[PDB]
């Protein structure tokens, strides 16, 4: 179906411990394919990227060097914009990339920033205007408008970003375009003589997007369900569980429903003693 390419970049100052660390991690969907780290001991991630030649790597490493310098300079300017002292550690994050539909056409582009965990500025969906969070970001917005930065970002997002994502999807088809369905089971643990926990498990799935819900007599138990955050297994796949506390003997009134791309249609699971 749809796919995305995204880079997640983090710059973090560390006064007294050298220049700010900068790290950029690239993903296609939920698969990391590259990492650049200013603290990397040796610069030289995914198998389908291995076929790219020296020229590809030359250009990517140069881009990383540019971003390192740009983000270190931004960190310096940001301290000024917020009247902050030179003593503390601060963080600049950015995300950017493209989403494409099944036919590989642009669905939308992304380019946004956060400073110390707070949204700072973002390129609007039109790829032509900015949304600035505060008076500091309004300065960036003024400068970026004067320098026609959005025109250049729109150019990358509509052209290069999409072109490369299509290419990665083609070369990495066997994994990137394969959905692995959840392996599911229900467990039962008494918490007392009068109540028990039913836990609905989903394991080994890709991509990460999944829906797990419990129903009682066909009604969603949103408020009573404990849902853990979807978590990586370490081997490409993801895991999740949802649990409800039920009265002893009423277990059969409860059904777990699983929706995932790798599933023809939703599963319906019950505890089977």
């Amino acid at each position: 179906g749809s796919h995305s390419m995204r880079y997640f970049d983090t710059a973090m100052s560390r006064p007294g411990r050298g220049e700010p660390r900068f790290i950029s991690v690239g993903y296609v969907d939920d698969t990391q394919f590259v990492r650049f780290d200013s603290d990397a001991a040796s610069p030289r991630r995914a198998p389908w990227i291995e076929q790219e030649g020296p020229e590809y790597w030359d250009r990517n490493t140069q881009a990383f060097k540019t971003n390192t310098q740009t983000d270190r300079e931004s960190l310096r300017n940001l301290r000024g914009y917020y009247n902050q002292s030179e003593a503390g550690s601060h963080t600049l994050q950015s995300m950017y990339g493209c989403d494409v539909g099944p036919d590989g056409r642009l669905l939308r582009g992304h380019n946004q920033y956060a400073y110390d965990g707070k949204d700072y500025i973002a390129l609007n969906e039109d790829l032509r205007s900015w949304t600035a969070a505060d008076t500091a970001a309004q300065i960036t917005q003024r400068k970026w408008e004067a320098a026609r930065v959005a025109e250049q970002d729109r150019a990358y997002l509509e052209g290069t970003c999409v072109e490369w994502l299509r290419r990665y999807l083609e070369n990495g088809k066997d994994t990137l375009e394969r959905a692995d369905p959840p392996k599911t089971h229900v467990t039962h643990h008494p918490i007392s003589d009068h109540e028990a926990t039913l836990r609905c498990w989903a394991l080994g799935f890709y991509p990460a997007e999944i829906t797990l819900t419990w129903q009682r007599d066909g009604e969603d138990q949103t408020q009573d369900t404990e849902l853990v955050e979807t978590r990586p297994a370490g081997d490409r796949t993801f895991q999740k569980w949802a649990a409800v506390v039920v009265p002893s003997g009423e277990e059969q009134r409860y059904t777990c429903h699983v929706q995932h791309e790798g599933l023809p249609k939703p599963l319906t699971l019950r505890w089977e003693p």
Binding site: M5, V34, F36, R59, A63, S74, Y81, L92, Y113, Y120
Partner: peptide, 9 residues
């Protein structure tokens, strides 16, 4: 494929 971001904040 990394975007080289030439303009800072």
């Amino acid at each position: 494929f990394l975007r080289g971001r030439a303009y800072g904040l």
